[PDB]
């Protein structure tokens, strides 16, 4: 036999251990349209109908975005857009209200509630109206049979909607 | 009432969804010592005893490294080093053998098997010996009651040892 | 050499694979008290203050219940009760309202909103009042620095409150 | 307004929280065949070829078993059987050896090592041979592109093989 001394410079005393990390995917959509009717005299929404081009998703990552279009997510070939249609606005006060509407994702429809929070009602520089409001609320993937193949473990059953809107009077 | 048109430039149609991601933590130790007895005539290890300074862990991230020293991981104040002591080497052939030894982590001891893979036996430039070998094997956190507070979900019960050694003859 | 034939009766061609499963822990509390002021003329809550004896938790499992009392959950020795104090009731209509109050868990306090849903307002057999309502809402463990040691992976950051109340007039 | 007292008997102060639980799926196969050549003089395997009817899986649960046959697992319509073919047996001693072979799952093939552990070599009541051995080892789903759709989070990349064999001499 024979004795050796490590060469610390070309020796690695190494280990690998697997762990999980929870993180939020944040995303918007670049391309959508809305029809907004609002009465600044009473701080009530009268009609709110949004259509979102699924195609235009942006989670700040190209490969995931493309993946979102596929059969196991949006199926944008078949169902190119998601729609929201307001059915009812219940004023709480001038800053706050409960908004009820029909959300349609990949052809499945469910009535959801969003929390309307009016961040500002104004008359502009030019004497024409402005508003700034937010719509917030949790929807469940399962309620829309959305991404059924993906486990509620890997990806949460809960999506959190945060629609932040600035908007000016028409014509 | 009154009609508005979104200002696309100050409107975000946004969502947040939580997901899990699996990843490997890879780490070595900067500071360790070893005693290596090997017989290049028969490709057998005769004695292999390593001591690793827990303090010197490096997972390429400072905040985790410091955290590894704490009570819920290594407890480096109380147990500053981990030790491996070979008990038995069973040659398979000149490239391969089963190494049995006692691993001690934070004062708990268990007999583990590593797979010896001899990457090269040589005589150096100067006519003095060299060897290059690896030791590989899976150990279970649970077997060493290590990081008991951390769930086997978050952090895997399995640690994978990959000890890569270059070493030269002594004196 | 020699040839053999399996004894199918004492042969197991076996495998073990680890998987995760998501499930809800459901629980109530056996022991709590409440003070309830309500105006059946206007369907408004006037005062609603609840105190819950942490000790009396019941998740239909004894070992978990005991565990819930410990330092890494409720710390029932130090903080024996959780309290809810209503601060504001905003009527939506006679069936629905937004309730705002202060929740206190292990000495940490946060203002939460619950969704009041009045399931029934009545005059009893005896001509004395009754009500049946529910309070629902999501609270975040993190907002109350509750069970900080447990990862948001293993146990969800979201707790869902479902307070189902039947109640009769006093004196 | 008016004051009420809870009816503790029809009041639930309730909560629901989601958590993950890790567990092992254990399974065998009811229907398989093997060809076993072994030399009790030298405790060496000479030939070991197994074929397993995927159809006959049993994880003590019918709905999962059926599911295992489907496209996202075994695809038993296309690939009805899994095969193991020994390529090399390296004796360690009479109780232990390293077995190398080709595992084929759903038409994908990889060379794996199992740890042979000979639990007993005998001559029977009738003077004809017996053996009892085990084969153990970890295989990676990813190495066989098996259940590619299922995340390594939900279901572990590691399957642990435990083949427990009793067997008697032929003819
Ligand atoms: C013979 C050398 C043995 C090396 C064994 C070292 C065991 C290291 C365990 C590391 C754990 C990392 C945890 C990261 C925290 C993320 C949550
Ligand atoms: C009214 C606007 C509604 C917006 C709802 C959009 C739902 C988005 C779901 C995104 C899913 C991301 C999955 C990432 C894949 C990682 C695995
Ligand atoms: C030589 C014998 C080899 C046996 C290998 C069999 C591999 C079995 C994999 C089983 C997967 C179970 C998945 C359960 C679904 C839960 C989600
Ligand atoms: C107004 C009433 C509020 C009820 C809130 C109670 C919060 C309960 C949290 C329970 C946590 C269960 C954890 C199970 C341990 C499994 C790991």
What would you say this structure looks like, in words?
- The structure is a homotetramer of 171-residue chains.
- With 171 residues, the first copy, chain A, is mainly beta.
- The first copy, chain A, has one domain (22-171): Lipocalin.
- The first copy, chain A, is built from one helix and ten strands, in the order βββββαβββββ.
- In chain A, the strands form two sheets. In chain A, strands 3-4-6-7-8-9-10 form a seven-stranded antiparallel beta sheet, with no helix packed on it. Chain A has a two-stranded antiparallel ribbon with strand order 2-5.
- In chain A, a hairpin with a 2-residue loop joins strand 7 (96-105) and strand 8.
- Chain A is elongated.
- At the A-B interface, strand 1, strand 2, strand 3, strand 4 and strand 10 of A face strand 1, strand 2, strand 3, strand 4 and strand 10 of B.
- Strand 2 of chain C pairs antiparallel with strand 2 of chain D, so a sheet runs across the interface.
- Bound molecules: eicosane (LFA) (4 copies).
- One eicosane (LFA) sits between chains D (25, 50, 52, 64, 84, 155, 159, 161, 163) and C (13, 15, 17, 19).
- Chains A, B, C, D: Residues 3-168 form the Lipid/polyisoprenoid-binding YceI-like domain.
- Chains A, B, C, D: It comes from Campylobacter jejuni subsp. jejuni serotype O:2 (strain ATCC 700819 / NCTC 11168).
- Chains A, B, C, D: Keywords: Signal.
- Chains A, B, C, D: This is Periplasmic protein.
């Amino acid at each position: 036999m024979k004795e050796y001394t490590l060469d610390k410079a070309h020796t690695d005393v190494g280990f690998k251990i697997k762990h999980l990390q929870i993180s939020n995917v944040k995303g918007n959509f670049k391309d959508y349209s809305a029809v907004i009717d609002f009465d600044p005299a009473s701080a009530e929404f009268k009609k709110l109908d949004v259509t979102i081009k699924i195609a235009s998703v942006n989670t700040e990552n190209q490969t995931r975005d493309n993946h979102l279009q596929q059969d196991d997510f949006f199926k944008a070939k078949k169902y190119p857009d998601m729609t929201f249609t307001m059915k009812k606005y219940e004023k709480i006060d001038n800053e706050k209200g409960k908004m009820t509407g029909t959300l349609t994702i990949a052809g499945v429809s469910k009535d959801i509630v969003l929390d309307a929070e009016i961040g500002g009602v104004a008359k502009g520089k030019d004497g024409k109206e402005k508003i700034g409001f937010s719509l917030n609320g949790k929807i469940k993937r399962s309620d829309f049979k959305f991404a059924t193949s993906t486990s509620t473990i890997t990806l949460s059953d809960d999506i959190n909607l945060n629609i932040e809107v600035e908007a000016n009077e028409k014509e």
